[PDB]
């Protein structure tokens, strides 16, 4: 059952083949593939999902102007 925490899995996909990051790739802690998979990475983190008042106001303001009409 859901825990009502408001959290969800945030996935970030890094297909960074050919990238010169200018700094080390230290996030992935496992072993190297010795191939292009060493330039790509997936990040998954359970995080509280939060929506600002500005965003909510923005969606309203861009929705109220397109309501179905006669």
């Amino acid at each position: 059952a859901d825990d009502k925490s408001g959290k969800a899995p945030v996935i970030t996909v890094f297909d960074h083949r050919g990238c010169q990051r200018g700094g080390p790739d230290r996030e992935y802690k496992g072993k190297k593939a010795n191939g292009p998979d060493d330039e790509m990475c997936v990040k998954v983190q359970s995080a509280k999902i939060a929506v600002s008042a500005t965003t909510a106001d923005s969606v309203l303001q861009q929705t109220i102007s397109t309501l179905y009409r006669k």
Partner: protein, 164 residues
């Protein structure tokens, strides 16, 4: 709360475990990289087809309600993206859908409107996965992702059934 990272050898192995690994991660990428747009468009479309949702008696009235609704849309979208990453719906059903209809019934969150919000997010996701745009408008190699599109569509259908 600590983030997990899957690259190099671990990522090599992962793409041996899930089907169509490379395409599958492109599919996930196309959704999460457009997450805020998918969620806002679905909520906006839910409302434009039913303006009473933002009338004083509607369930999206006030910034507080709108934000909670946009938040829920993102929670659901993200659990669907994790189902696509994983290749099954187990976590989606257990951590998101199970108990959710009962929650919405006690809060009075309208089921007819959630049904439409979910179907629009589904339409977004299918279009990004089964993207028929020209090669010059794609960041990925043009190919057939119809199986992944049907799979993600199925995950949305499980959302719809759970809170329908």
């Amino acid at each position: 709360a600590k983030a997990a990272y899957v690259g190099g050898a671990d990522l090599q192995a992962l793409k041996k475990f899930i089907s169509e690994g490379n395409k599958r991660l492109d599919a996930v990428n196309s959704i999460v990289s457009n997450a805020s747009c998918i969620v806002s468009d679905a909520v906006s479309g839910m409302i434009c087809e039913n303006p009473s949702l933002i009338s004083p008696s509607g369930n999206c009235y006030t910034n507080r309600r709108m934000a909670a609704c946009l938040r829920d849309g993102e929670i659901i979208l993200r659990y669907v993206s994790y189902a696509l990453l994983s290749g099954d719906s187990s976590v989606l059903e257990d951590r998101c859908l199970n108990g959710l209809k009962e929650t919405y019934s006690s809060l009075g969150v309208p089921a007819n409107s959630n049904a439409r919000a979910v179907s629009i997010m589904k339409a977004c996701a299918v279009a990004f996965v089964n993207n028929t745009a020209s090669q010059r408008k794609l960041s990925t190699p043009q190919g057939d992702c119809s199986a992944l599109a049907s799979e993600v569509a199925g995950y949305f259908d499980k959302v719809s059934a759970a809170i329908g």
